[PDB]
Amino acid sequence: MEFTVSTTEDLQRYRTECVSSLNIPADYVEKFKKWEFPEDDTTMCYIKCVFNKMQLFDDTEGPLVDNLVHQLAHGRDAEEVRTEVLKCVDKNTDNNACHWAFRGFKCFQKNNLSLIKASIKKD
């Protein structure tokens, strides 16, 4: 079972295809490059697509905890990472998948953004 962690280089690939597919305006893309994600439905579906191609989010189960700690805990205790992730894992009470994935991402980065940058970083 070969698991390929998504580095920054891989991330630039997935994110590009999601951009060209979801008709994401280049202006928004500039924001994303500076790690700026506006609270808007465009950005939300963008995050969903990216997180999906990275095999990190599913439209049914939501955030894939296993892959999440395997990815994020790049250089940190996976058990603690699992915990922090779970504190951002919720149910789709909003009933929109783009916003669901976006809420998980937004929740986590607001407390642990450095880990996100490090997870995709080749140490």
Ligand X SMILES: CCCCC/C=C\C/C=C\C/C=C\C/C=C\CCCC(=O)O
| 120 is a contact residue toward ligand X (CB under 6 A) | yes
Question: Would you count residue 78 as binding ligand X (CB under 6 A)?
Answer: no
Phi/psi at 57 (5° precision): -140, 140
Per the annotation, does 103 bind a ligand?
no
98: contact with ligand X by CB under 6 A: no
Pick 97 or 119: Cβ nearer ligand X = 119
Q: According to the annotation, is 28 in a ligand binding site?
A: no
What's the CA gap between 34 and 58, in Å, rounded? 26
Indicate whether 32 belongs to the interface with ligand X (CB under 6 A). Answer: yes
Encoded tokens for 11:
């991330």
Cβ neighbors of 108 (< 8 A, separation 6 or more) are 84, 85, 88, 116
The helix (run of H) or strand (run of E) holding residue 58 is strand 57-58
For ligand X, the binding residue among 68, 73, 81, 97 (CB under 6 A) is: 68
Q: Does 105 bind ligand X (CB under 6 A)?
A: yes
Structural contact between residues 14 and 21, judged by C-beta atoms closer than 8 angstroms: no
Q: Which two tokens stand for residue 56?
A: 């990190």
Among 44, 45, 49, 50, interactor with ligand X by CB under 6 A: 50
Q: Which of 24, 56, 73, 98 binds ligand X (CB under 6 A)?
A: 56
Q: Is 100 in the site for ligand X (CB under 6 A)?
A: no
Residues pairing with 63 in the sheet: 57
Q: Which of 19, 22, 72, 98 binds ligand X (CB under 6 A)?
A: 72
